[PDB]
């Protein structure tokens, strides 16, 4: 079982926002939704984004508690 990296504020915010857009836009391909979400995500303010950054920060600290020795080791091509 490999450990996956903690989800960042955008990935966490997209998990719930991505489903919201799919229910309202269930025929839109993720390729286009991913583009509109990025456009909408860039329009949020820091105060509004803060609540999502803190949660990613908490998920990162809690993720670190589960695997305190985990290290990000990307594969070089």
């Amino acid at each position: 079982d490999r450990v996956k990296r903690p989800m960042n504020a955008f990935m966490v915010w997209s998990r719930g926002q991505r489903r919201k857009m799919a229910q309202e836009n269930p025929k839109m391909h993720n390729s286009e939704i991913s583009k509109r979400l990025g456009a909408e995500w860039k329009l949020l303010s820091e105060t509004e984004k803060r609540p999502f950054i803190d949660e990613a920060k908490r998920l990162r600290a809690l993720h670190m508690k589960e695997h305190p020795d985990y290290k990000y080791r990307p594969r070089r091509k």
Binding site: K57, A61, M64
Partner: protein, 129 residues
């Protein structure tokens, strides 16, 4: 021995990263704070290498004291110029102060920058790889 040994540096690195994350700062944030608060900014790259001990013991030893102040308290040459420079290097590997001054104005680049470029280039040529 007064300075931190390898095991102690590994512990400091551990502690530093924990505190940084606990406080909500990115590696970049810390590097920036080091310049604003202590007069010596550091890049995200250096903070990442320090936290992973991807540096020599000699370099980690220099940096630890500096990052410790933070911890306590928290509680370029153009592409075209390059090619021409390479062409020149090909002609003459070691141009004189005069040759160099010419080449500088010719390229509209500061003299010292050019003197250093040729020095770095001669060094790179002496490398195995």
């Amino acid at each position: 021995e007064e300075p931190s040994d390898l095991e102690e540096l590994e512990q400091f690195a551990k502690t530093f990263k924990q505190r940084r994350i606990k406080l909500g700062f990115t590696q970049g944030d810390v590097g920036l704070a080091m310049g604003k608060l202590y007069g010596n900014d550091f890049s995200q790259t250096t903070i990442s290498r320090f936290e992973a001990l991807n540096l020599s013991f000699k370099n980690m030893a220099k940096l630890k004291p500096l990052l410790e102040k933070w911890l306590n308290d928290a509680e370029s040459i153009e592409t075209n110029i390059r090619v021409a420079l390479e062409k020149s290097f090909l002609e003459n590997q070691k141009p004189t102060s005069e040759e160099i001054t010419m080449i500088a104005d010719q390229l509209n680049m500061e003299k010292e920058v050019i003197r250093v470029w040729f020095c770095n280039r001669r060094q790179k040529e002496k490398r195995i790889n």
